[PDB]
Write an enzyme that holds these catalytic residues in place. Structure first.
Site, PDB file in Angstrom:
ATOM      1  N   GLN B  11       0.823  -1.206   0.000  1.00 53.86           N
ATOM      2  CA  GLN B  11       0.000   0.000   0.000  1.00 53.86           C
ATOM      3  C   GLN B  11       0.859   1.259   0.000  1.00 53.86           C
ATOM      4  O   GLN B  11       0.627   2.180  -0.791  1.00 53.86           O
ATOM      5  CB  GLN B  11      -0.944  -0.009   1.203  1.00 53.86           C
ATOM      6  CG  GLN B  11      -1.650   1.316   1.443  1.00 53.86           C
ATOM      7  CD  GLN B  11      -2.678   1.240   2.556  1.00 53.86           C
ATOM      8  OE1 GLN B  11      -3.477   0.305   2.617  1.00 53.86           O
ATOM      9  NE2 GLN B  11      -2.661   2.227   3.444  1.00 53.86           N
ATOM     10  N   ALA B  99      -0.933  -9.862   3.456  1.00 52.86           N
ATOM     11  CA  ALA B  99      -0.065 -10.542   4.406  1.00 52.86           C
ATOM     12  C   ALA B  99      -0.458 -10.308   5.859  1.00 52.86           C
ATOM     13  O   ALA B  99       0.212 -10.840   6.750  1.00 52.86           O
ATOM     14  CB  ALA B  99       1.386 -10.108   4.187  1.00 52.86           C
ATOM     15  N   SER B 140       7.179  -0.252   2.162  1.00 51.39           N
ATOM     16  CA  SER B 140       7.204   0.103   3.572  1.00 51.39           C
ATOM     17  C   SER B 140       7.983  -0.939   4.366  1.00 51.39           C
ATOM     18  O   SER B 140       8.236  -2.051   3.900  1.00 51.39           O
ATOM     19  CB  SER B 140       5.783   0.224   4.130  1.00 51.39           C
ATOM     20  OG  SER B 140       5.136  -1.038   4.158  1.00 51.39           O
ATOM     21  N   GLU B 183       5.120  -3.905  13.544  1.00 53.58           N
ATOM     22  CA  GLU B 183       5.930  -3.264  12.513  1.00 53.58           C
ATOM     23  C   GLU B 183       7.414  -3.230  12.852  1.00 53.58           C
ATOM     24  O   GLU B 183       8.226  -3.318  11.916  1.00 53.58           O
ATOM     25  CB  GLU B 183       5.413  -1.845  12.235  1.00 53.58           C
ATOM     26  CG  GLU B 183       4.014  -1.797  11.670  1.00 53.58           C
ATOM     27  CD  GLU B 183       3.653  -0.440  11.093  1.00 53.58           C
ATOM     28  OE1 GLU B 183       4.567   0.368  10.814  1.00 53.58           O
ATOM     29  OE2 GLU B 183       2.445  -0.184  10.909  1.00 53.58           O
ATOM     30  N   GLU B 254      26.446   5.588 -10.308  1.00 51.43           N
ATOM     31  CA  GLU B 254      27.045   6.773  -9.702  1.00 51.43           C
ATOM     32  C   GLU B 254      26.453   7.064  -8.328  1.00 51.43           C
ATOM     33  O   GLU B 254      27.142   7.622  -7.466  1.00 51.43           O
ATOM     34  CB  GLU B 254      26.880   7.977 -10.629  1.00 51.43           C
ATOM     35  CG  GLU B 254      27.732   9.170 -10.244  1.00 51.43           C
ATOM     36  CD  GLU B 254      27.704  10.272 -11.282  1.00 51.43           C
ATOM     37  OE1 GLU B 254      27.580   9.958 -12.484  1.00 51.43           O
ATOM     38  OE2 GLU B 254      27.798  11.455 -10.893  1.00 51.43           O
TER      39      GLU B 254
HETATM   40  N1  LIG Z   1       3.995   7.736   3.817  1.00 53.51           N
HETATM   41  C1  LIG Z   1       3.043   6.813   3.694  1.00 53.51           C
HETATM   42  N2  LIG Z   1       3.074   5.688   4.495  1.00 53.51           N
HETATM   43  C2  LIG Z   1       2.111   4.743   4.377  1.00 53.51           C
HETATM   44  C3  LIG Z   1       1.085   4.891   3.456  1.00 53.51           C
HETATM   45  N3  LIG Z   1       0.277   3.812   3.556  1.00 53.51           N
HETATM   46  C4  LIG Z   1       0.767   2.988   4.511  1.00 53.51           C
HETATM   47  N4  LIG Z   1       1.899   3.558   5.032  1.00 53.51           N
HETATM   48  C5  LIG Z   1       2.763   3.005   6.088  1.00 53.51           C
HETATM   49  O1  LIG Z   1       2.998   1.634   5.841  1.00 53.51           O
HETATM   50  C6  LIG Z   1       3.068   0.915   7.054  1.00 53.51           C
HETATM   51  C7  LIG Z   1       2.347  -0.417   6.882  1.00 53.51           C
HETATM   52  O2  LIG Z   1       2.626  -0.939   5.601  1.00 53.51           O
HETATM   53  P1  LIG Z   1       1.496  -1.030   4.457  1.00 53.51           P
HETATM   54  O3  LIG Z   1       2.071  -0.584   3.133  1.00 53.51           O
HETATM   55  O4  LIG Z   1       0.303  -0.181   4.825  1.00 53.51           O
HETATM   56  O5  LIG Z   1       1.085  -2.590   4.411  1.00 53.51           O
HETATM   57  P2  LIG Z   1       1.245  -3.465   3.066  1.00 53.51           P
HETATM   58  O6  LIG Z   1       2.563  -3.152   2.398  1.00 53.51           O
HETATM   59  O7  LIG Z   1       0.098  -3.211   2.119  1.00 53.51           O
HETATM   60  O8  LIG Z   1       1.275  -5.001   3.561  1.00 53.51           O
HETATM   61  P3  LIG Z   1       0.000  -5.681   4.275  1.00 53.51           P
HETATM   62  O9  LIG Z   1       0.244  -5.831   5.757  1.00 53.51           O
HETATM   63  O10 LIG Z   1      -0.240  -7.049   3.681  1.00 53.51           O
HETATM   64  O11 LIG Z   1      -1.204  -4.799   4.051  1.00 53.51           O
HETATM   65  C8  LIG Z   1       2.428   1.780   8.130  1.00 53.51           C
HETATM   66  O12 LIG Z   1       3.351   2.032   9.164  1.00 53.51           O
HETATM   67  C9  LIG Z   1       2.079   3.085   7.444  1.00 53.51           C
HETATM   68  O13 LIG Z   1       2.550   4.187   8.184  1.00 53.51           O
HETATM   69  C10 LIG Z   1       1.046   6.020   2.647  1.00 53.51           C
HETATM   70  O14 LIG Z   1       0.140   6.162   1.827  1.00 53.51           O
HETATM   71  N5  LIG Z   1       2.030   6.980   2.771  1.00 53.51           N
HETATM   72 MG   LIG Z   2      -1.889  -3.878   2.465  1.00 52.36          MG
END
Ligand SMILES: Nc1nc2c(ncn2[C@@H]2O[C@H](COP(=O)(O)OP(=O)(O)OP(=O)(O)O)[C@@H](O)[C@H]2O)c(=O)[nH]1
Ligand SMILES: [Mg+2]
Ligand SMILES: Nc1nc2c(ncn2[C@@H]2O[C@H](COP(=O)(O)OP(=O)(O)O)[C@@H](O)[C@H]2O)c(=O)[nH]1
Ligand SMILES: COc1ccc(/N=N/c2cc(OC)c(OC)c(OC)c2)cc1O
Ligand SMILES: [Ca+2]
EC number: 3.6.5.-
Lengths: 155, 437, 426
Positions: B11, B99, B140, B183, B254
């Site tokens: 996400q 996940a 993330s 996390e 680079e």
């Molecule tokens: N900067 C920013 N951080 C995000 C955003 N969406 C989620 N996060 C961060 O991502 C972390 C969790 O990872 P996610 O990307 O939401 O989860 P995922 O990668 O979809 O994996 P799953 O657990 O299967 O849903 C959290 O700590 C959020 O702060 C976003 O749109 N912008």
């Molecule tokens: Mg997700």
């Protein structure tokens, strides 16, 4: 053996069968393998009619089993209010102590029989009676936070 | 011209990647349908923006991007968004179950039934390239897909593309905008397994971006929209050298040559300035010396740490807009001696400078105001070890009692990997200490 | 992760389950016929989590009803929403259980578990992406307790990766003075520790103390108790039935709320406390962490919070909620475990419940829940020491060794709560 049939008759509550056996000389104070009398079972299963007839025919109101349970212990545990008052009216020991250190007040308080708790207190139930772990009836009300039970024990 | 393929995982990777590609089109003059009217060559070309955009026969400019998520909720918004015509429809890959914020599900179980499909679609984009140089991976740390699936994807790309580079844009977890309590676990697990397969990784501390939105932008309650808009602004300043002409960080190699002195310490610190709220269109125009001074203030950094605690190994200044090279050298000469800027004993103690004379582009709807000049500093400092220390502490607080561990062991993962990952993080912190922090 | 199958077993299960289907159908704007009579959207974006589409602007609850007593079959139908349920889902046996846990788990219940499992099959195949199951019942009776736990173990065998979530009603002498309920409850907790992922412990003891002492109900009825139950079930499932971000995954809830597999017994809370026919952000956050607002008869100030989840509903400032939540964690900082960082989650929803502009739903995994298990284990021990009524169970196949194993597991469960209650981080 008519005593064994008398044990089974008092359990099921057959008022007619108890009278026929006693008329033939059945042991009213007979016991089973664990020392339970026909008065224990009748008080356990809530047969008030058999309890009264047994007491009119030489039943020991304070008989204990192998675990030290009196008919008042079981009636207070299961929660037969009418049987408890009848037992007390025939000289039952309100402060009888079984092998686990419990009194009739303990079992009624543990199971939440507030009506029986009030009845036992008015017949001299010792509120300072400790069990095999030092707990009294009032300690049981405070350990599990039973406010309804704590107010009754502060008459 | 050497093509770069961007990969957006999870996400956080998809939503940030969606904001970066919107900004890329505004900088290059590309329309949502892919039309680039300022492209005299239709059907192809050797230009520098072709590293990020392929060209179909009808003049359509399609990004070299792959969007991957184990659940379709986030990518479906890209299929219905404004740029629904821009991306390849077959490069938006979605699963059925995510996940569940579990690194094990993203890597061992759920992520394993789509990894072969993602690689075949990435293969299709690589077959069109004439000189592929590497990948850009957005994800993330805390998410199950962003950590579990990314660590799996990076392992696969090192075997199928062993001679290509791999850069990361990582989202560092922050308690203000965190979604899971585990996390810290997922961040340690993916770092250990990817540390070998990553050449350079730019971490984005969500708490850093969150505080910048509250202070400079007067945003009381920053949302994912406010964060990603500022993040895409900084990501574009980093990848601008790959998309335009210049003489600093012109290719992915680079980046590794100028920023990564040793393979394991490949986490540069990024600083950006200035950040001015869009409510002030008549603000005072900050000089070259004032925006360069702001790069050494810890309040403008993308990762919460104190660079005065550590020492520098490399420093790159990327200017954008009305910037005269004479003023940079003068600004450098002053902010070279009036600050406590300590370089390590074994480095040239120099500042590399690259200037792009086009002012930064702002998106309609954003929170940033137009500026005539901006600067993005890329520095590798040992002070960034503070980020690893904070993350390893929260990891140790939970693992000592084995909290939430049964969730990971129940998904094909062994408890012995928790120890191997933490031991590797202890060596990483020690790697920064042997240099000075 | 989307569809959820709901099952209600026994009298208490169908009683608290029917009220659940009557309250949530009003929020989404669903009439007893199944049509959508709502004036605003967002009521149908997550409608398929608990409902299906039966053609003709119709929405049918994904519910399955089971009880050995055929009297509940007529009790549900006679309700105001007792016609939206499908006639193919009603599964009712011949005779009841009579508060015998053995008749539900080994004899009468096993002679009906295949009838229920067949309709769970055709319901699971109607789901595009099933995420778990939901069961409402009580632990004191024989059907909802004995057969409920058996059905849980049978569905788990065929759906090992699906989440099992239950709303269990703890027995209490203040509402039902039946002395065999500590038996059936202890034999059920022994099953729920192994075959469930998350259990909402609703305590009739706590529900009576709220109506009698806080709501001034001298003789509270089951309708009075179920009003608090239906208000809690709606709140704990808020993020499942409306957008408000935060996804809607039962597994994501379990990963962040269950730090140890056996400690999946949650303590729910609700505020404000309203009656059947009868605040600000600093007030909602205050009552949530109050023992008088907990639906389990436990004082949270006697233990430590492992994980906490709070759901706010209605129009309110998300900034002010962050101030009050972060502040409550400081005045009561010694009541949260320090070895789980950021162990409190806050969620806000736009649509509040009916008859209330604002509300708050508390979901806590506190060590103080041992006081509930200590209460039943004491009643179990008092009855089991005298072997009272034990032949009711040994005559149905079950034997004496299961009572001791069930007793040994709950005292081990209490030992685990106290173990993590005294653990320090240093
Ligand atoms: N900067 C920013 N951080 C995000 C955003 N969406 C989620 N996060 C961060 O991502 C972390 C969790 O990872 P996610 O990307 O939401 O989860 P995922 O990668 O979809 O994996 P799953 O657990 O299967 O849903 C959290 O700590 C959020 O702060 C976003 O749109 N912008
Ligand atoms: Mg997700
Ligand atoms: N809160 C609540 N508890 C109930 C309700 N109905 C029954 N109970 C409790 O459930 C226990 C009886 O179990 P029950 O479900 O009726 O037996 P079953 O029919 O075999 O499942 C009693 O101790 C009651 O206190 C209800 O509507 N609400
Ligand atoms: C200790 O930290 C945490 C505790 C709980 C957290 N989330 N909790 C929920 C609660 C839900 O409904 C009650 C969800 O709706 C079903 C839900 O769907 C995703 C999540 C998150 C935490 O980071
Ligand atoms: Ca061209």
């Amino acid at each position: 053996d008519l005593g064994k049939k008398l044990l089974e008759a008092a359990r099921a509550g057959q008022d007619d069968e108890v009278r026929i056996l006693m008329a033939n000389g059945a042991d009213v104070n007979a016991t089973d393998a664990s020392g339970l009398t026909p008065l224990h079972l009748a008080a356990t299963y809530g047969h008030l009619e058999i309890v009264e007839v047994l007491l009119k025919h030489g039943a020991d109101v304070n008989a204990i089993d192998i675990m030290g349970s009196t008919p008042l212990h079981l009636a207070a545990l299961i929660g037969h209010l009418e049987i408890v008052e009848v037992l007390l009216k025939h000289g039952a020991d309100v402060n009888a102590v079984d092998t686990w250190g419990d009194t009739p007040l303990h079992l009624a308080a543990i199971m939440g029989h507030l009506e029986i708790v009030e009845v036992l207190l008015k017949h001299g139930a010792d509120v300072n009676a400790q069990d095999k772990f030092g707990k009294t009836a009032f300690d049981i009300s405070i350990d599990n936070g039973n406010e309804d039970l704590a107010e009754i024990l502060q008459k | 011209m050497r093509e770069c393929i961007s990969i957006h995982v999870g996400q956080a990777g998809v939503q940030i990647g969606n904001a970066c590609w919107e900004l890329y089109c505004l900088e290059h003059g590309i329309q949502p349908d892919g039309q680039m009217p300022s492209d005299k060559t239709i059907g192809g070309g050797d230009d520098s923006f072709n590293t990020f955009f392929s060209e179909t026969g009808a003049g359509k400019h399609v990004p070299r991007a792959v969007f991957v998520d184990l659940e379709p909720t986030v990518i479906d918004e890209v299929r219905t968004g404004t740029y629904r015509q821009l991306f390849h429809p077959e490069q938006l890959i979605t699963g059925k179950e995510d996940a569940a914020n579990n690194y094990a599900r993203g890597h061992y179980t759920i992520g394993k039934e789509i990894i072969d499909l993602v690689l075949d679609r990435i293969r299709k984009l690589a077959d069109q390239c004439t000189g592929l140089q590497g990948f850009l991976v957005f994800h993330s740390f805390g998410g199950g897909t962003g950590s579990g699936f990314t660590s799996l994807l990076m392992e696969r790309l090192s075997v199928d593309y062993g001679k290509k580079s791999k850069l990361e844009f990582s989202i560092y977890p922050a308690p203000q905008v965190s979604t899971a309590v585990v996390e810290p676990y997922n961040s340690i697990l993916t770092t250990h397994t990817t540390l070998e397969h990553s050449d350079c990784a730019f971490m984005v501390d969500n708490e850093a971006i969150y505080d910048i939105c509250r202070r400079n932008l007067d945003i009381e309650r920053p949302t994912y929209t406010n964060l990603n808009r500022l993040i895409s602004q900084i990501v574009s300043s980093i990848t601008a050298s790959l998309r335009f002409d210049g003489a600093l960080n012109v290719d992915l190699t680079e980046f590794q040559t100028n920023l990564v002195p040793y393979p394991r310490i490949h986490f540069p610190l990024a600083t950006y300035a200035p950040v001015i709220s869009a409510e002030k269109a008549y603000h005072e125009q900050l000089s070259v010396a004032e925006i360069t001074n702001a790069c050494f203030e810890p309040a403008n950094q993308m990762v919460k740490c104190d660079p005065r605690h550590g020492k520098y190994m490399a420093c790159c200044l990327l200017y954008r807009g009305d910037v005269v090279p004479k003023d940079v050298n003068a600004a450098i000469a002053t902010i070279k001696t009036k600050r406590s800027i300590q370089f390590v004993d074994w480095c040239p103690t120099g500042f590399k400078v690259g200037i792009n004379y086009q002012p930064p582009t702002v998106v309609p709807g954003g929170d940033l105001a137009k500026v005539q000049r901006a600067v993005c500093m890329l520095s590798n400092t040992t002070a960034i070890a503070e980020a690893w220390a904070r993350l390893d502490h929260k990891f140790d607080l939970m693992y000592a009692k084995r909290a939430f561990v049964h969730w990971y062991v129940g998904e094909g993962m062994e408890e012995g990997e928790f120890s191997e990952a933490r031991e590797d993080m202890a060596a990483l912190e020690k790697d920064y200490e042997e240099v000075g922090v | 992760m989307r569809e959820i199958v709901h099952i209600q077993a026994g009298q208490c299960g169908n009683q608290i389950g029917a009220k659940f289907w009557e309250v949530i159908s009003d929020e989404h704007g669903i009439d007893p016929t199944g049509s959508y009579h709502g004036d605003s959207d967002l009521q149908l974006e997550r409608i398929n989590v608990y409902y299906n589409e039966a053609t003709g602007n119709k929405y049918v609850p994904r519910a399955i009803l089971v009880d050995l007593e055929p009297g509940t079959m007529d009790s549900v139908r006679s309700g105001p929403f007792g016609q939206i349920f499908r006639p193919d889902n009603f599964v009712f046996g011949q005779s009841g259980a009579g508060n015998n846990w053995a008749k539900g788990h080994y004899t009468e219940g096993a002679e009906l578990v295949d009838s229920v499992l067949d309709v769970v099959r055709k319901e699971s195949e109607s789901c595009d992406c099933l995420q778990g199951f939901q069961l409402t019942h009580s632990l004191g009776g024989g059907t909802g307790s004995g057969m409920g736990t058996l059905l849980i173990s049978k569905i788990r065998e065929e759906y090992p990766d699906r989440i099992m979530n239950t709303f269990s009603v703890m027995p209490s002498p203040k509402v039902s003075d039946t002395v065999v309920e500590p038996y059936n409850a202890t034999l059920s907790v022994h099953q729920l520790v192994e075959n469930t992922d998350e259990t909402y412990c609703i305590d009739n003891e706590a529900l009576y103390d709220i109506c009698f002492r806080t709501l001034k109900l001298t003789t509270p009825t089951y309708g009075d108790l179920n009003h608090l139950v239906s208000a809690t079930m709606s709140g704990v499932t808020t993020c499942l039935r409306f957008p408000g971000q935060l996804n809607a995954d039962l597994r994501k809830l379990a990963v962040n709320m269950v730090p140890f597999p056996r400690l999946h017994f949650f303590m729910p809370g609700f505020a404000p406390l309203t009656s059947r026919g009868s605040l600000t952000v600093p007030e909602l956050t205050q009552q949530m962490f109050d023992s008088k607002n907990m639906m389990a008869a436990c004082d949270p100030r006697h233990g430590r919070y492992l994980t906490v989840a709070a759901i706010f509903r209605g129009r309110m400032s998300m900034k002010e909620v962050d101030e009050q939540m972060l502040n409550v964690q400081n005045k009561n900082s010694s009541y949260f475990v320090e070895w789980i960082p950021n162990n409190v989650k806050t969620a806000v929803c736009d649509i509040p419940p009916r008859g209330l502009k604002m509300s708050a739903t508390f979901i806590g995994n506190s060590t103080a829940i041992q006081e509930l298990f200590k209460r039943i284990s004491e009643q179990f021990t008092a009855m089991f020491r005298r072997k009272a009524f034990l032949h009711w169970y040994t005559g149905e196949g079950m034997d004496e060794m299961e009572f001791t194993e069930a007793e040994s597991n709950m005292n081990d469960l209490v030992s685990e709560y106290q173990q993590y209650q005294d653990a320090t981080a240093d």
